[PDB]
A paper describes a structure:
Phage portal proteins are key viral components located in a single pentameric vertex of the capsid and they act as initiators of capsid assembly.
The channel valve of the portal was found in its open conformation, which should allow the free passage of DNA into the ejection channel. There is also movement of the clip (5 Å), caused by the interaction with the gp11 adaptor in the assembled tail. The gp12 nozzle protein forms a hexamer attached to the bottom of the adaptor protein. In the mature virus, the gp12 nozzle protein is the main molecule responsible for closing and securing the DNA inside the tail.
Numbering used by the authors:
A (entry chain e), I (entry chain d): 2 to 50
B (entry chain d): 547 to 735, 745 to 794
C (entry chain M), H (entry chain O): 7 to 196
D (entry chain L), G (entry chain A): 294 to 342
E (entry chain X), F (entry chain N): 6 to 196
Write the structure that this text describes.
């Protein structure tokens, strides 16, 4: 009956554990990401030539 | 602003600081005294950001006009930049001088009103005290060791307050998405430092309100606590 | 607008239900609580003079069009306007009053209307002042300081204020059934 | 022989509208609001008679 | 702004006696934060309870006189409600001055005869109305500053008791008989 | 998309005054997320409350003229409900044009006489319907963005009060007498 | 001998539709909305007579 | 289909009950919320023109079969079709109309039917537009955003909208008992 | 339904974490302040020349 959650800290990182195993915030695949503590989840720095 | 702090050391409870203007290089003393008086005189420890104890010389008072001419390169070492200058007397007389448009190099004068033959005059800058509270929302303690704050739902604020203890005058600015409010707070209606609870209304979404406190007016300020009072209907549940 | 000596007491008595007295209300970008309660006050004024009372209804009033524009001007001050006898034929259209039977807007001569003109928080009887203060206090309760018990007591006390103000209206302008109206005045002529 | 119409202040109907209406004019109001003041000596009237 | 009265201090002291401690000699807006606040609520109820119209307050045949040079008679906030003497009362305030909505004018040559209600103090009222004014201002103070259900329920019951007593005072002050004192059935019983 | 009005701003400002803070001079879809959304709710209730049919909105004997070359008459979304004058109304919209479901045709030589109801602004309405339109839009805004039981219950009671007052305005605007005004029992009382 | 039709504002029925309808015309409304203002002196009328 | 300027406002007012406005809905595999509310909208349209209203029941309409196929085609556009007088003899069978008394399918000449044709969200009166929007808002509430209080208020407000729209139908097409029907038209011929 | 909190110890200090991350009492910018333990939050000592 109208449940809500708020996964609030997507620092996370991939975890290939099953669905009913995980913590919150983790994710199943994360490419080119960067999970800082205060700022949440950024696109990675852009590789200056 | 435009002032470079180029050292900092601290003997036991006195932080001696040299600090560079765009014209000079100073030396100072930040004393962590609680109710004591910095310079000899000074009836209430005037928060002044620079603090001389000057005696007005003989020839400054034009007999035609009403003001005296105090020259700020003489009461200090040399010139200044820009800032708001407050002049305090052994009475409760507080005169605030605004900065000139070019600023304290085109107009190095300080037009104190009255007849000042010789009398202890305390002149200084003004502190720019700024503090924001936080974005007000539900903050409940998650069983002894973490603070998880509650995001789901709309929290419509009604009021807020600032508990102050033996403090002066201050201004609780409240900003919104497209609005502005000032909410001054006078004395205890001399000095009249008060020890009450100023209760100001903030109305909005609490995700867009932002309350911030200013104070410039030379008096101490002791914010010992705050708190708010919202509505918070939630169209969901927990589990 | 302008400060009014009684209107500040009204905005203060709105905040008598919740919190602290403000001072003098004379700034647009100001104390948000005072200007917000002042808006609720003027809304309950504009609604409480809308219902029709027998001191507000100026009965046989005559409006005149502009001599150049030939176009009599409806206003937001003109609160609700009707005709004198029955089957009122005047309605606002553009900001200008308009016949819905003559199908025309331009008026040569004047016009006879039962009109309500918007008055202040002053220029009202003290019965109605207490009723606007209590109903606007109920609105100010329900929209900002949502506490239930003060809503219950302000609902009960609004009902008592309207009771008194209906008593004021049936005591202002004694309406007798058989010697003052239009139909059964002529039936009792001997 | 003194008709007094008691209008109930708690209600809606109001006598600026009963009276001004011609005969057979609809007008707004509820019927439980207007009543008329009777004199309810009935047992006293029968014992006196 | 007003000056204190020896009975008004006991009235405000009986307002604070509902929730709070007794003050003495108010004299300031900063003596107690609750004393002057309850004094404002008490003056509001003092204005309100005389609006209802009572047999000792409706001064029947009073005559207002306009200013001589101004040719104009002044409605006041001191005037509480003013009506005409017989029926279809033609007087209402506009601007701050009384005004005819039938004669359509605001210039009076001679005087004007009015059923007016003038505002009086907490004093110059009967003790019935003093007690009911204190209990109603106590309910208003309670519901606005220490709102609690028990003290609210008992002040509501006790306000209804005070109104019962003061309607008994109104039906006792100024004896009203149906058949020998009014206007219509005084003539019907002339033999 | 519309341009602002001096009273529509106070209307939307009284919608946000149910739950929220007062905005000024809307002018954008990004000034406040809640302001323009409540302005959409206000225009929807503006379209709805004039659909009920009122004695100043039903423009009785109106005449619509078709285009000269197109031989065709344009139904609009601005047209709100259009009926015939006497009985068994034969006019209905199809395509964007009015159409006779009995003549089975949409080519008109001369005009067409219609009891039409037109859409008007928030302005050009009486203050009765302004207050009722603000209260019904406030209830709709409350139930859709900050649904709370107390403010919903009091806005429901207060919507019923507004509808009561506005039915009083309709029964006062255009006095409808039973025996000297209608069509059947006017002729029965001709002597 | 003064018919006043009291229409109840809280209801649905409204007199732009009673009156314009010819005889035996269906029209929308509830019957508890329209009533008519009586004069309920009955005990006074019997004692006066 | 095609975008319609009123229909996007309808799908927006469905989502005015919950959340944020979408834009223009013109993609099949798209915003799932917009296509989902649009399916609910067209279902409530097909149900709200199903009940039979006096502007919808096109009374004496004539259908004609194909010249080659000799067969008049029932459609999903043909919402509900009945015969003119009584004991209606027409039913859908295969996608084609069919006589359950003649026990035949092929029609030589035309056919006279009281038929209902499916119309858009446009080409309806504003009463019925508000009723389809509010009933589809109740359905969209009950099926996706399951909150109780908004369902209670949409139920009450659907009842008010149906009240208004029955007022529209008893006002559109004045039905009089004793001078307009088929039985007591003749009983009152003198 | 009429919630109240009391952030009671504004020792705090700035924290540029997001809104749904923080502790109480912290703040988003603090200039010229001084957060003692017992006395709450003072204007800083005034820099004697």
């Amino acid at each position: 009956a109208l449940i809500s959650q708020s996964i609030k800290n997507l620092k996370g990182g991939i975890s290939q554990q099953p669905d009913i195993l995980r913590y919150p915030d983790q994710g199943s695949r994360q490419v080119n990401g960067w999970s800082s503590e205060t700022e949440g989840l950024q696109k990675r720095p852009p590789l200056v030539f | 602003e435009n002032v470079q702090v180029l050292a900092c050391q601290s003997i036991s409870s006195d932080m001696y600081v040299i600090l560079r203007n765009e014209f000079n290089t100073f030396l100072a003393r930040i004393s962590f005294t609680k109710n004591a008086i910095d310079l000899q005189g000074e009836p209430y420890r005037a928060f002044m950001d620079m603090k001389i104890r000057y005696t007005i010389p003989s020839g400054t008072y034009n007999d035609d006009t009403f003001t005296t001419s105090i020259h700020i390169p003489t009461i200090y070492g040399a010139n200044f930049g820009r800032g708001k200058i407050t002049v305090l007397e052994p009475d409760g007389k507080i005169t605030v001088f605004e900065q000139p448009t070019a600023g304290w190099n085109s107009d190095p004068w300080l037009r104190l009103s009255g007849n000042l033959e010789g009398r202890m005059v305390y002149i200084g800058f003004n502190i720019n005290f700024v503090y924001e509270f936080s974005k007000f929302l539900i903050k409940q303690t998650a069983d002894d060791g973490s603070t998880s704050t509650e995001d789901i739902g709309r929290l419509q604020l009604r009021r807020a307050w600032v508990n102050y203890e033996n403090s002066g005058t201050f201004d609780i600015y409240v900003e919104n998405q497209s609005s502005n409010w000032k909410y001054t707070m006078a004395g205890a209606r001399r000095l009249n430092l008060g020890t009450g609870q100023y209760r100001f209304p903030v109305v909005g979404n609490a995700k867009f309100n932002t309350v911030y406190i200013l104070s410039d007016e030379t008096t101490p300020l002791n914010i010992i606590g705050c708190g708010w009072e919202g509505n918070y209907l939630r169209r969901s549940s927990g589990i | 607008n302008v400060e009014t000596a009684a209107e500040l007491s009204a905005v203060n008595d709105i905040l008598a239900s919740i919190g602290e007295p403000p001072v003098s209300t004379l700034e647009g970008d100001a104390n948000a609580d005072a200007a917000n309660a002042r808006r609720i006050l003027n809304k309950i004024n504009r609604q409480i003079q809308s219902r029709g009372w027998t001191f507000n209804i100026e009965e046989g009033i005559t409006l005149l069009p502009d001599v150049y524009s030939n176009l009599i001007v409806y206003s937001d001050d003109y609160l609700s306007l009707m005709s004198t006898s029955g089957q009122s034929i005047y309605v606002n259209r553009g900001g200008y009053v308009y016949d819905r039977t003559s199908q025309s807007d331009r008026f040569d001569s004047g016009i006879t209307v039962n009109i309500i003109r918007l008055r202040d928080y002053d220029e009202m009887p003290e019965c109605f002042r207490y009723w606007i203060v209590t109903k606007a206090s109920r609105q100010f309760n329900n929209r900002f300081f949502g506490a239930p018990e003060v809503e219950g007591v302000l609902q009960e006390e609004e009902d008592e204020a309207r009771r008194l103000c209906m008593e004021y209206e049936m005591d202002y302008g004694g309406y007798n059934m058989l010697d003052g109206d239009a139909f059964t005045s002529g039936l009792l002529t001997r | 022989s003194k008709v007094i119409g008691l209008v109930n202040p708690a209600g809606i109907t109001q006598p600026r509208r009963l009276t001004k209406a011609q005969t057979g004019d609809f007008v707004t109001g509820r019927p439980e609001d207007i009543s008329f003041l009777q004199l309810e000596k009935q047992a006293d009237f029968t014992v006196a008679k």
